[PDB]
């Protein structure tokens, strides 16, 4: 084993690799949403930029796990980054619903990794997750839920004026 | 077709999507090289950072093609981003050789896209490639070749002192 | 011939003059749109200013072709600048549709001039078009298409509230 | 018991005292390494200073446990600080190997204290360890491992030129 490795279970190492892949996958989904809202026949630029920013943040999340793996003496093992589930995202409401579910999927995986770390008596990995991941998730889930509520209030999907107004006054 | 589309051949649109995928693939390979050189049993931080920076630039290259696609009225279509060809990269020389070949692969694809654009009488796409892609490629290929030459001069792969010196005085 | 003239075909010279005229014509159309949206019974000032700005930019486009003609040793030959096709422009949606078509007409003429320049083996004229004209066109066509999409979303032509909102939040 | 004491087990109090002693012991070992590398017949000043700095940081670690003990209503109990295991440290490689093992010994003791705190249902002590100790350990272990790798690459122990180069380009 690595000269640096201490109290780092093989199962946790492997789980870190899978979580890395899922972060990359989330990043890629967000990128797809950015491109959709930038289409000339969609044209909701502030919504597009919101998703672009989320893509960038997810990539940063992935990078932090790569660094973490190496710090602990694990070995980064990469897999294919699966394309997003859809090629087109409907409208702001449908996209935000999909984003909420993605954020919740990522959060579940983080929580599962925390449980594993707990089971394996790895406080360093627990702290990493708590300090760098779990609160960001909660915040983003809350933000996206709030947006959903507002999009419904504004009459989505049918009310295009409502969708326009959201793009112009919510995505800040 | 899109209301904005003008002089944009379906074949070029599709080729733009494939090129996007290849940029993403290059980005991912570089990320793998970054992680390898950051391993505790490799530990060539400046080399690692060189590759990290190249990964970031490739991702930016990809993003610019997404924007381009939409500007022309094409539609972004994503595919899986294949994992890199190797899980470990040997040493600085082996990695730089692999990088040279990757850069040359990317360059060939750009040149092929330019030929297609020429064939389809698309000067806008030709200009985009010439102005935003082709010269960056040439520069990076030259830089990497120069590095290879220096790594060989320094006695790689066998001369570990040479490898150390490269990390400390070349990657700037 | 002019002492400066070199590799400049008569057909290209003439085509430059026609393109100059078309730029002037586009400028004049935009000016008409500005005046319409400034009418007291239309009163969409930000829309008016958008068109005023486009008129000014088209005039600048024309001026650059005059300079170009002289640089190459051609001779500027002016024709009448035809009045716009309409005296009144309906509403924001109708105007933006007309603008999209005008931009596409101008773009086609630029592309045709590029093909001529290519046929006559004039790389200087090709570069001029690519560097100073073609990308601006693509950008403006995209912007206008995006606007159209939003005006439709907002319920134009029937939804006057939608039209008001566009004037107040899109034309920036 | 102390008026401030709440949820603080006697076993944890005692373990805090032992950990304090071990921090002091680590500090003293590092000081010995500093003095060795400052000898006229060793003369690796940057290496010396690296160890001096680590000694200082370990002393600060100790001080923080004294403060902690008092905050919780425990009582600081001091024991002798044992002299280091060696009087002389060979060379940069041997010293860095000894440092890695010392850091790992300290880390194991921290992890053991965390397990005790967990067993005794003391979240405050768990947080203290996670927030102030465990990540610093991981970082230092990684840094030292990286150094070891580089010293081996440079041909230590036999390659004195390699040792010189390390002192001049790694200890930053
Ligand atoms: Cl372990
Ligand atoms: Cl294990
Ligand atoms: Cl973040
Ligand atoms: Cl699969
Ligand atoms: Cl779909
Ligand atoms: Cl999901
Ligand atoms: Cl967080
Ligand atoms: Cl409003
Ligand atoms: Cl077309
Ligand atoms: Cl086609
Ligand atoms: Cl670049
Ligand atoms: Cl495949
Ligand atoms: Cl491999
Ligand atoms: Cl390749
Ligand atoms: Cl370039
Ligand atoms: Cl001539
Ligand atoms: Cl001629
Ligand atoms: Cl312009
Ligand atoms: Cl006539
Ligand atoms: Cl009319
Ligand atoms: Cl027209
Ligand atoms: Cl341009
Ligand atoms: Cl108590
Ligand atoms: Cl007790
Ligand atoms: Cl510290
Ligand atoms: Cl004793
Ligand atoms: Cl000794
Ligand atoms: Cl020890
Ligand atoms: Cl810490
Ligand atoms: Co923007
Ligand atoms: Co997010
Ligand atoms: Co994430
Ligand atoms: Co980054
Ligand atoms: Co997220
Ligand atoms: Co966030
Ligand atoms: Co760095
Ligand atoms: Co590059
Ligand atoms: Co690239
Ligand atoms: Co970016
Ligand atoms: Co590249
Ligand atoms: Co050309
Ligand atoms: Co570059
Ligand atoms: Co005004
Ligand atoms: Co314009
Ligand atoms: Co023009
Ligand atoms: Co002027
Ligand atoms: Co125009
Ligand atoms: Co413009
Ligand atoms: Co000093
Ligand atoms: Co230390
Ligand atoms: Co300590
Ligand atoms: Co102090
Ligand atoms: Co220490
Ligand atoms: Co905890
Ligand atoms: Co430290
Ligand atoms: Co030097
Ligand atoms: Mg394993
Ligand atoms: Mg997975
Ligand atoms: Mg698939
Ligand atoms: Mg926090
Ligand atoms: Mg909020
Ligand atoms: Mg097609
Ligand atoms: Mg491909
Ligand atoms: Mg495969
Ligand atoms: Mg050019
Ligand atoms: Mg250039
Ligand atoms: Mg150079
Ligand atoms: Mg003539
Ligand atoms: Mg004409
Ligand atoms: Mg007439
Ligand atoms: Mg340009
Ligand atoms: Mg825009
Ligand atoms: Mg007691
Ligand atoms: Mg002890
Ligand atoms: Mg003794
Ligand atoms: Mg914590
Ligand atoms: Mg911390
Ligand atoms: Mg480091």
From Swiss-Prot, chains A, B, C, D:
<dbReference type="GO" id="GO:0005737">
    <property type="term" value="C:cytoplasm"/>
</dbReference>
<keyword id="KW-0479">Metal-binding</keyword>
<dbReference type="GO" id="GO:0008199">
    <property type="term" value="F:ferric iron binding"/>
</dbReference>
<comment type="subunit">
    <text>Oligomer of 24 subunits. The functional molecule is roughly spherical and contains a central cavity into which the polymeric mineral iron core is deposited.</text>
</comment>
<dbReference type="GO" id="GO:0004322">
    <property type="term" value="F:ferroxidase activity"/>
</dbReference>
<keyword id="KW-0408">Iron</keyword>
<dbReference type="InterPro" id="IPR009040">
    <property type="entry name" value="Ferritin-like_diiron"/>
</dbReference>
<comment type="similarity">
    <text>Belongs to the ferritin family.</text>
</comment>
<feature type="binding site">
    <location>
        <position position="140"/>
    </location>
    <ligand>
        <name>Fe cation 2</name>
    </ligand>
</feature>
<dbReference type="InterPro" id="IPR001519">
    <property type="entry name" value="Ferritin"/>
</dbReference>
<dbReference type="GO" id="GO:0006879">
    <property type="term" value="P:intracellular iron ion homeostasis"/>
</dbReference>
<feature type="binding site">
    <location>
        <position position="61"/>
    </location>
    <ligand>
        <name>Fe cation 1</name>
    </ligand>
</feature>
<feature type="binding site">
    <location>
        <position position="23"/>
    </location>
    <ligand>
        <name>Fe cation 1</name>
    </ligand>
</feature>
<feature type="binding site">
    <location>
        <position position="103"/>
    </location>
    <ligand>
        <name>Fe cation 2</name>
    </ligand>
</feature>
<dbReference type="Pfam" id="PF00210">
    <property type="entry name" value="Ferritin"/>
</dbReference>
<keyword id="KW-0560">Oxidoreductase</keyword>
<dbReference type="GO" id="GO:0006826">
    <property type="term" value="P:iron ion transport"/>
</dbReference>
<comment type="function">
    <text>Stores iron in a soluble, non-toxic, readily available form. Important for iron homeostasis. Has ferroxidase activity. Iron is taken up in the ferrous form and deposited as ferric hydroxides after oxidation.</text>
</comment>
<feature type="binding site">
    <location>
        <position position="137"/>
    </location>
    <ligand>
        <name>Fe cation 2</name>
    </ligand>
</feature>
<dbReference type="GO" id="GO:0008198">
    <property type="term" value="F:ferrous iron binding"/>
</dbReference>
<feature type="binding site">
    <location>
        <position position="58"/>
    </location>
    <ligand>
        <name>Fe cation 2</name>
    </ligand>
</feature>
<feature type="binding site">
    <location>
        <position position="58"/>
    </location>
    <ligand>
        <name>Fe cation 1</name>
    </ligand>
</feature>
<dbReference type="InterPro" id="IPR008331">
    <property type="entry name" value="Ferritin_DPS_dom"/>
</dbReference>
<feature type="domain" description="Ferritin-like diiron">
    <location>
        <begin position="6"/>
        <end position="155"/>
    </location>
</feature>
<dbReference type="InterPro" id="IPR014034">
    <property type="entry name" value="Ferritin_CS"/>
</dbReference>
<dbReference type="InterPro" id="IPR012347">
    <property type="entry name" value="Ferritin-like"/>
</dbReference>
<dbReference type="InterPro" id="IPR009078">
    <property type="entry name" value="Ferritin-like_SF"/>
</dbReference>
<protein>
    <recommendedName>
        <fullName>Ferritin, middle subunit</fullName>
        <ecNumber>1.16.3.1</ecNumber>
    </recommendedName>
</protein>
<keyword id="KW-0409">Iron storage</keyword>
């Amino acid at each position: 084993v690595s000269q640096v490795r201490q109290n780092y279970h093989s199962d946790c190492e492997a789980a870190v690799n899978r979580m890395l892949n899922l972060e990359l996958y989330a990043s890629y989904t967000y990128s797809s949403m950015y491109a959709f809202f930038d289409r000339d026949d969609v044209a909701l630029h502030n919504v597009a930029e919101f998703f672009k920013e989320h893509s960038h943040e997810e990539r940063e999340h992935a990078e932090k796990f790569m660094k973490y793996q190496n710090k602990r003496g694990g070995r980064v093992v990469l897999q294919d980054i699966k394309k997003p589930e859809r090629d087109e995202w409907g409208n702001t409401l449908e996209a935000m619903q999909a984003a909420l579910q993605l954020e919740k999927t990522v959060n579940q995986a983080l929580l599962d990794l925390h449980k594993l770390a707990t089971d394996k008596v790895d406080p360093h990995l627990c702290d990493f997750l708590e300090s760098e991941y779990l609160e960001e998730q909660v915040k983003d889930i809350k933000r996206i839920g709030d947006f959903i509520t507002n999009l419904k209030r504004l009459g989505l999907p049918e009310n295009g004026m409502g969708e326009y107004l959201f793009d112009k006054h919510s995505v800040k």
